[PDB]
Design a binder for this molecule. Sequence first.
Ligand SMILES: Cc1cc2c(cc1C)N(C[C@H](O)[C@H](O)[C@H](O)COP(=O)(O)OP(=O)(O)OC[C@H]1O[C@@H](n3cnc4c(N)ncnc43)[C@H](O)[C@@H]1O)CNC(=O)NC(=O)C[C@@H](c1ccccc1)C[C@@H](O)N2
Length: 636
Amino acid sequence: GVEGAAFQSRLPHDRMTSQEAACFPDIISGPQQTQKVFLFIRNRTLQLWLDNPKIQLTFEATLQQLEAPYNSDTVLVHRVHSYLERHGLINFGIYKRIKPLPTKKTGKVIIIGSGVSGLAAARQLQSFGMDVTLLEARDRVGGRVATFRKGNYVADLGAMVVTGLGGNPMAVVSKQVNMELAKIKQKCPLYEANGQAVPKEKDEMVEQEFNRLLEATSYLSHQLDFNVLNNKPVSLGQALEVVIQLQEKHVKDEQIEHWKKIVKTQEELKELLNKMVNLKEKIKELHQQTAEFLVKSKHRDLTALCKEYDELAETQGKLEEKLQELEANPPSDVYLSSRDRQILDWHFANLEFANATPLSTLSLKHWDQDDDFEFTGSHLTVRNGYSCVPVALAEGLDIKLNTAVRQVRYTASGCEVIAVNTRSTSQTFIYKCDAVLCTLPLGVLKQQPPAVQFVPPLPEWKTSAVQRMGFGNLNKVVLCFDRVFWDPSVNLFGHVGSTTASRGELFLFWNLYKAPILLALVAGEAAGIMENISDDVIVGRCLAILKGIFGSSAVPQPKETVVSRWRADPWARGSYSYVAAGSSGNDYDLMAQPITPPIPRLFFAGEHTIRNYPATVHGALLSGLREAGRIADQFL
Ligand SMILES: Cc1cc2c(cc1C)N(C[C@H](O)[C@H](O)[C@H](O)COP(=O)(O)OP(=O)(O)OC[C@H]1O[C@@H](n3cnc4c(N)ncnc43)[C@H](O)[C@@H]1O)CNC(=O)NC(=O)C[C@@H](c1ccccc1)C[C@@H](O)N2
C-alpha cells in the first residue's frame, strides 16, 4: 500500500535517504520510534499525491486525510510536506492549484532552453512564487522532444520511448498529460541485406553469442580490471574485439587438436597396413610348404599365422572406423561466417543505437554505470506523440521563443543574459536577473567555437568535464504511406547491413503509430555521415530495403517523409550524452554542480547533469526538479 509509494518515488520504504538525514537531523539523531513515524508520514503523503496527481496536494489536505495517530502531530507533518514539495516529489508537473499564486514574486531566474528540464524547473520555480522567464532559440518548446504532426500522421523525431513506469516520474506526467502509451512487442525479426529473413536457429544463436561476448567484456572490466592499457582507457569496442579474437583462437586451437588426432590415427593405419603386408608375405611363404609329421607341423603354424592375421584385420577395421568417426565429427572451421558476423554487427548496431555512439568511444568501465537505476515494467512508445508532454508543461509560462542566448554574465551582484532574435539578428535583448539556470545541451556547451560565452569564463573543472563527456548522435527517417504493408503483429524489424563500418545504416524499423508510419533508425558511425545525404536519397535507400523485404510491388511510394539531422541541428548538436572512455559518472555530478563567483548564481540542469538517469527524458525532468529545489533553497 504505502510501501509502493516510496518505491514509485525512487526511495526505500523502510530507510531514510542521506538528503532526509540532512534535512531532519533531529530525527536520525533521535529515537527510532520518531524515525518510523517520519517514514510513515512521508510514504503516506507520497501515496496521497500519486493516487490523484491531477490536483495539488496541500498541507491541509495531507493533515485531513491522515490516519488517526499521525494527524495529531501537525508540525512534523508540515515539515515532511514542505520537504517533499520543495524537492519535487509531491507537487510537480501539471496540476490544478487549490489556491492561486501570490501576485508578488520574490526572485528573478532566467532559464536557458525550453526542453523538459527547463520546463520542469520553470514550473517548479513558478509554483514557489518566483519570477521565471524561459529563453528558447527554436520556434517551439520540447527541445530534443520533437514530434512531426501533419494530417493524420504523428511521428516522434527525438525521444519516443518511456522506459518502464515503476519508479519513473513520467508515470505521473503521463497521468497528468493523458499520454497515450503503448507497450512494445518484443519480437524483432531480422532480415538480411538480400531481403530473406534470418531463420530463428541462427537468430537465437547469434543473440546468445552477442550476450556472451558482452558479459565477457564486463568480466574483463570488473574482476580482471582490464581498464587501462598502454596508458589509454579501453573502449567497449576494444574489449569486444579482444573477446572475439580470444574465441577465434579457441576455434583454431580445437581445429588443430582435431587435425592432430586425425593425423596420428592415419599414421597408425599406415603402419598397420605395412605390418599386414609383411605377414601376408610370411603366410604367402609358408603356404608353399615323419614327412607326414612335418606337414602336420607346417599346417599347425600356418593356422597360427592366419589367426594372427585375423587379429590384425579386426584391429584394422576398428581403427578404420575410429578414423571415419573423426572424419565425420569435426569442430567448427570458423567462429563466425560472413552472415554470422553481419547478424552480430546488427546486434552491435543496436547497442550503438542505445548509447547513441560508436562502441569504440564508450568507456568500458562505466558505459552502463546507470543500469542499477533502470525502472521496472515493459518499455512503451508514445502513440499520442511525445511533444504532448512539453507543450502541456509550457502552459502558463513566460516563454520567449526565437530568442537565442549568446552571452551569460554572472557576478556577485546579479546576472545578465544577452540574446538575439533568430528571425532578425539585428534586434538584441538583454535580461537582468538574480539567477540563471542553464539547460543548454552538452553539444552546445562542447562547441569549440562557443555559441554562448560565459563571463567570467567557466572554471577549469567544469570545462574539463564538458570536454571529457561524450555527446552522441542518432537519427530517424519517418515514412508515411497510405496502406500498411508490414506485419502489424510486430513493432520492430531489423535490417542486417553488409559491412561492419555501416552496420548502423537503416538497421532498425519501428511500427508504433496509428497511421501507416514506418520509422527507420540511423545509428553509430552512419548517424553523422548520412546527415550529409539528401532526403530523397535516404528515402530511396529505405524504400530499397523495404522492397527487398516485402516485394517491389508491395511497397508504395511514400506520401510524406521527414529526416532528422540532430548533429547538424545547432540547438542540439547530437542526440544525447554517453560515458566516453575518459569520463565517468562523477563528471555528470560535476555538470550538476553550480558556479559561485558569496552565493551561487549559475545553475545547471539537463540530460547531462543527472548521474543516475542520463540520456533520458525522465533524467531531464528529475534534474529540472532538483535544480528548482536548489535555487529555491538559496533564494527563499
Ligand atoms: C533522437 C533522440 C532520440 C531519443 C532521445 C534523443 C534523441 C535526440 N532521447 C534524448 C532525450 O530527448 C533527452 O535526454 C531529453 O530530451 C533531454 O532534455 P533537455 O532539456 O536536457 O535537452 P533539450 O535539448 O531537450 O533542451 C535544451 C533547450 O535549449 C534550447 N537551446 C539550445 N541552444 C540554445 C541557445 N543559445 N539559447 C536558448 N536556447 C537554446 C534548445 O533548443 C532546447 O530547446 C531520449 N530520451 C528517452 O528517455 N527515451 C528515448 O527513448 C530516447 C532515447 C533513449 C535514451 C535512453 C534510454 C532509452 C531510450 C532513444 C531515442 O529513440 N529517443
